[model samples]
Target: RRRVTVRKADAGGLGISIKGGRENKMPILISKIFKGLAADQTEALFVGDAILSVNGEDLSSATHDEAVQALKKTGKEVVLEVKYMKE
Candidate 1:
């Protein structure tokens, strides 16, 4: 599969946004939340509205191929205690 180009959010916010390409037939807006952090602490961060990390793990390091391998090891509901940031 071809690589997808990702761009920063246009609103000058904290996180980055993904832009679809020709193969991206159906585009959608999605966000991932990392559970376990304190509400107050999480709120203190920039754009606290979107908390992408929990303990210390990150999703940006996770690739589509890696995700498939992870699913094989764990189940669908994989427990991740980590923080994620947009690249």
Candidate 2:
């Protein structure tokens, strides 16, 4: 898992956004990387990166909005367990 620690202030409304992927595959994908935000500065986060969990909450079976809600519960520093496509 590619882990990313995104500071809350710069998370810019979660500092980023996510999109749910295939129903039977990777749960969610990082569809956007906002410029000048915490996610923008992280090498571990990128478009197409899959979200596995938020903090310790597994989002592997969550919907797009559900995953967002889970992430919202995180505090000042949000840690995301991610999956990056192999280069």
Candidate 3:
């Protein structure tokens, strides 16, 4: 597990898509990372990674929509606690 902080672009978002969540009885996973975007630039987060938390709010029990909303609600600079999934 690791912590990564990324800044959102003025025009682009975190540049990542998400999948899975507590609602699905699964960890929140990074489904995709766009090229040249904040998430991609960080070079720390990656696809198949589980988002443990965002800005200190726990997503361990969050639904997919809730997780997405959380990310959107955060400021430009975002801090993430994540874990790389083996499966």
Candidate 4:
């Protein structure tokens, strides 16, 4: 796993949408990335990456709603602990 940290306020958004969660019995997958947003600007985060946590708060056992709330509650800077999908 690797950590990808990005600034949220500068871009006004995290710039990614997620799929899967405890509700789906899966890890949170980076389903989509919005162009010109924070994540996009970082050039580190990517679609298909699985998020393990945000700012050290674990999301491995979180539901979709729980993950959403976690992102919403974060500060301007967010650190994502992620794992890349193997081909």
Name the candidate that leads on lDDT.
3
| lDDT by residue for model 2 (53-72), tens | 77867887887778887876
lDDT (0-100) at residue 35 of candidate 4?
Answer: 81
Q: Total clashes, candidate 1? A: 5
* Model 1: how far residue 75 lies from native, Å: 5.9
By TM-score rank, best first, the candidates go 3, 4, 2, 1
What are the per-residue Cα lDDT tens digits for candidate 1 across 1-87? Answer: 111121222322122122212233322111332233221223332221222221233333444333333323432222323222333
Model 3, residue 18: distance off in Å is 0.9
Off by over 4 Å in 3: none
Query: What is candidate 4's lDDT per residue for 26-82, written digit by digit as tens?
Result: 888788878877777878876788887888988989987878788777887789888
Better of 2 and 3 by lDDT: 3
What value of lDDT does candidate 2 attain over all alpha carbons?
0.73
TM-scores, all candidates, are 0.22, 0.76, 0.87, 0.86
TM-score of 1: 0.22
Give candidate 1 regions above 4 Å deviation. Answer: 1-57, 75-77, 80-87
lDDT for model 4, please.
0.79
